[PDB]
């Protein structure tokens, strides 16, 4: 009927199976173990082998490599390695059932039903929607009935990611400042009726003295929308919130300080900051987490025109500070100078903000870890531990005065959107945003190196990554618990 | 000088083709009541067959203003003048033949020509110098857009030359 | 006769003095306190004011701002801030005595006689030697007689730095692979007779199957020298050592994969890795630290010629691994593939290596902190704590498999001197070097962002920085103790 992803570890006396496959072997009377011997060398990590006709109702059975049974937290990779073995491994497996065009598949729990589900679901995702030429659409259910809410936690966590991924990936002519707001509101509302959405327009933004956000919007003839998300998780609604903030440029052409044509099509995912955090709130509502969260996202586009933002311009942020706009591509910093100010209105506990802010971050760590600068070691630890579980690493970076200094000197104004020099790129951009924040537990996450995947993360196919949505969701689960 | 300097230095979103004209007129008028100002608009410019000036203005959605300054310094007003002229791009991005981002913020001072000479007339009025001077300055911006000036284009200057 | 740098803090009832200046006030009978009132607003951090004729033997008296008395370790700047106040502050002071052309100056201990001496000495340094037009040469002694071995520890620590600085700064036609070896040997030998030097030549290198180091040397007609330093610090000479390794390109032109002319004159300090660590061993010998240290440094130049290293070339490192040399500017990685292998010969405890390795590090942190990747959290902590004392910060970076992977795939060979992509620049370069190391406590310090100073570090004038020589020296003091 349908396919099966089964698993095996690496040697003891005979390389063992995850019990479900030990059990499926008994079932086809040793003929799985036996054909695996006949096939060739053993299956190391995330390597795959397909065995036809072993079972009457499982014509294709893919056995995938899970590595060492007792693989655990790694001091060097700063993750739980087991989970990582299982994700790459059942992603691998699920992508094999899928090339065989088997529309459904049952997955071996592999000792961690959540890693299995985060592998099967992140593993299989594409964004097929505008290609009339699509791969088969395969339904992936758990094999078994024992470990069900952890597999659904995998499906949940990986699905919150695939949403950031679709929200990122879609061409920015479809994915506008209005359409993103609309899908996020429909997604947050299906998640919890204990929610409110506000797709606030230019009049409200104008009214909110958001000059910096608004200066950025004006080049395009596409409407700005400041989005406001509310999740009423706590028992007493009056609990102070945890506010997520995120930059939402639907398309970044650089503006007058215009980008080069080389691969500029990826700028459609410069709204990755707004996508990431939104998908993460949708998931804590889906999880129905005992915390009140607020989601904030400036949405607009960065375009050249007869009325675009010019180099040398002093605009005013909500908080009275003026910014010299010396480079029109440094606009996420400006979009975020106002949504960050508005975050203090809400009286929060933690203000996590996220943004595909600078390529220098990409030069720095470049898809290994997502750089997070925070004036809070508590907050750092909190993020870093979630990174170990989820596997979507996060690395700390310096919010030293050293850097505020280069952005704080300014010919016309109070702050300047770029620093005096080329060096320390992600650090000057983060020390510019510190100027718009006075809350003690603040964290900037620069998502610009983890924007994309190719081969680096296994269980993620080539394209927009939606990183770090699960670390973020894992942080709010641990914080709620 | 410090007036040309402030008139140069101010970010070109504040220092427009209209705001420069306005500060220069207030400065020239405080200097001497023996003055006249004309912050002539696009209709006058159109009328003055200023196709070349006007082609430049069209990329931006910011208004052109041709500024005209008069200082009546001489005893006999009929003395022929000394005319100062000066380029007043409030911001230069290069247009379609667009500049590189490296330090382009300084293009706010591409109206330095109009600033320099204006500040100089304001001072000869402040000095109340026995000469009639006339100040002339095209003000506009150079921007890329759906209706910006394209490469290869023949426009016509007031004098018939293309 | 001579000048005086005195100090004052920020308000209580009347902004207090460092006791020496309270004492110098009593001495000119309140007329220092009194003229400070008459002068204007109070002196905040590292700001300066000169008072002539207060004393008969102190014609110019500079009072410098020390900030808050109780300024201490900062959780955000990750340093001892007091020390930092005092360095910038008596550097400031000493540079004022010096423009007045007063050839000598007495310095206020300022509560930490070492920070005062590290400020006066780093503060005043230039490299005047090839200018017939030089500033005055001012002798800076302590004011007082109470706290003498800590001031001499400042003078020692700052002088080990100014040596890395002179060793960096000198034009690479003077500072050759032979001349560096010669000054280091004269400096290490004046420091301790319990030392040995080996300025090993091309024949020895050839003999040591150092194909990678040697491939790099061949473009130039300037001799390679592999330098070997020995400090016999321990009681039992048989104690295993702590081996420092460091890249010593006297000049880097990129080779065939040739650099652009823009500011290429700074490549004379691509031997900053060899300078840094050498200056640090010279200082632990000067300190006579109860540890055996070994200093290792490939010295050579990177030049284009009829026999330079070409793009696409497989050369062999001492350890059997082959490297595809796809970019001739990635040569520090190659120079270090062999000196790192040779480090395991010595049976070490810690292998600290240091190198002006990549500009991407400069894009990353860029003179804030010196990036240190280490497979040793112990080693990381050890370095990071020294950074807090000295003020010369050090930031951890990721030695994740993620990065080994991009350098480990290779068309012709085993490893490749550059990675498949532009991203994660310092991380691929550090994960390439991990391939030449099998010791548990290894640490790569990429010095390329801290190569230079301008205004960022106060007590250091514009030019080669000699960073992090004091963090390094402080680590060996703490390790010996
Ligand atoms: Zn941009
Ligand atoms: Zn952007
Ligand atoms: Zn190089
Ligand atoms: Zn080099």
UniProtKB/Swiss-Prot annotation, chains A, C:
Any one Gene Ontology cellular component term annotated for this protein: cytoplasm
Keyword entries, A-Z: Acetylation, Aminopeptidase, Cobalt, Cytoplasm, Dipeptidase, Hydrolase, Magnesium, Manganese, Metal-binding, Phosphoprotein, Protease, Zinc
Protein's cellular compartments: Cytoplasm
GO MF assignments: carboxypeptidase activity; dipeptidase activity; disordered domain specific binding; manganese ion binding; metalloaminopeptidase activity; peptidase activity
Activity control, per UniProt: Zofenoprilat inhibits Cys-Gly hydrolysis activity.
Tree of life domain: Eukaryota
Entry-annotated residues carrying Phosphoserine: 10, 19, 145, 159, 203
Cofactor info, note text: Binds two metal ions per subunit. Two metal binding sites with different affinities are located in the enzyme active site and can be occupied in vitro by different metals: site 1 is occupied by Zn(2+), Mn(2+), Mg(2+) or Co(2+), while the tight binding site 2 can be occupied by only Zn(2+) or Co(2+). One Zn(2+) ion is tightly bound to site 2 and essential for enzyme activity in vivo, while site 1 can be occupied by different metals to give different enzymatic activities. Mn(2+) is required for Cys-Gly hydrolysis activity.
One GO process term, biological-process aspect: proteolysis
Physiological role: Cytosolic metallopeptidase that catalyzes the removal of unsubstituted N-terminal hydrophobic amino acids from various peptides. The presence of Zn(2+) ions is essential for the peptidase activity, and the association with other cofactors can modulate the substrate spectificity of the enzyme. For instance, in the presence of Mn(2+), it displays a specific Cys-Gly hydrolyzing activity of Cys-Gly-S-conjugates. Involved in the metabolism of glutathione and in the degradation of glutathione S-conjugates, which may play a role in the control of the cell redox status.
Family that this chain belongs to: Belongs to the peptidase M17 family.
Protein name per its UniProtKB record: Cytosol aminopeptidase
This protein's encoding gene: LAP3
């Amino acid at each position: 009927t349908k396919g099966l992803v089964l698993g095996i570890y690496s040697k003891e006396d005979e390389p063992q199976f995850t019990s479900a496959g030990e059990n499926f072997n008994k079932l086809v009377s040793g003929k799985l173990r036996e054909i695996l011997n006949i096939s060739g060398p053993p299956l190391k990590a995330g390597k795959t082998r397909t065995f036809y006709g072993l079972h009457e109702d499982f014509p294709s059975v893919v056995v995938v490599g899970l590595g060492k049974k007792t693989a655990g937290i790694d001091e060097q990779e700063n993750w739980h390695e087991g989970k990582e073995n299982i994700r790459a491994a059942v992603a691998a497996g699920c992508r094999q059932i899928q090339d065989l065009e088997i529309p459904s598949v049952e997955v071996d729990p592999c000792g961690d039903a959540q890693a299995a589900a985060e592998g099967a679901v992140l593993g299989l995702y594409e964004y097929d929607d505008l290609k009339q030429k699509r791969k088969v659409v395969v339904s992936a259910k758990l094999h078994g009935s024992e470990d069900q809410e952890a597999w659904q936690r995998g499906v949940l966590f990986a699905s919150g990611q695939n949403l950031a991924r679709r929200l990122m990936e879609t061409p920015a002519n479809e994915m506008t400042p209005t359409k993103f707001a609309e899908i996020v509101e429909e997604n947050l509302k299906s998640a919890s009726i204990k929610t409110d959405v506000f797709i606030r327009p230019k009049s409200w933004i104008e009214e909110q003295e958001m000059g910096s956000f608004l200066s950025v919007a004006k080049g395009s003839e596409e409407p700005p929308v400041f989005l406001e998300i509310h999740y009423k998780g706590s028992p007493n609604a009056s609990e102070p919130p945890l506010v997520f903030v995120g930059k939402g440029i639907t398309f970044d052409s650089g503006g007058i300080s215009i980008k080069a044509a080389a691969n500029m099509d990826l700028m459609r995912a410069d709204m990755g900051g707004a996508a990431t955090i939104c998908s993460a709130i949708v998931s804590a509502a889906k999880l129905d987490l005992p915390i009140n969260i607020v989601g904030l996202a400036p949405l607009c586009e960065n375009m050249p025109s007869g009325k675009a933002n010019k180099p040398g311009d002093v605009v005013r942020a909500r908080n009275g500070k003026t910014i010299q706009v010396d480079n029109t591509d440094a606009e996420g910093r400006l979009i975020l100078a106002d949504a960050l100010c508005y975050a203090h209105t809400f009286n929060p506990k933690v203000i996590i903000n996220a943004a595909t802010l600078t390529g220098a971050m990409d030069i720095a760590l470049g898809s290994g870890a997502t750089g997070v600068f925070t004036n809070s070691s508590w907050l750092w630890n909190k993020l870093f531990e979630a990174s170990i579980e989820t596997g979507d690493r996060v690395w700390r970076m310096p919010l030293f005065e050293h850097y505020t200094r280069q952005v704080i000197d300014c010919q016309l104004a109070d702050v300047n959107n770029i620093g005096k020099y080329r060096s320390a790129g992600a650090c000057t951009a983060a020390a510019f945003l510190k100027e718009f924040v006075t809350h003690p537990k603040w964290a900037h996450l620069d998502i610009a190196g983890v924007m994309t995947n190719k081969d680096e993360v296994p269980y993620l196919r080539k394209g927009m990554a939606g990183r770090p949505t699960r670390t973020l969701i894992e942080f709010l689960f641990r914080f709620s618990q």
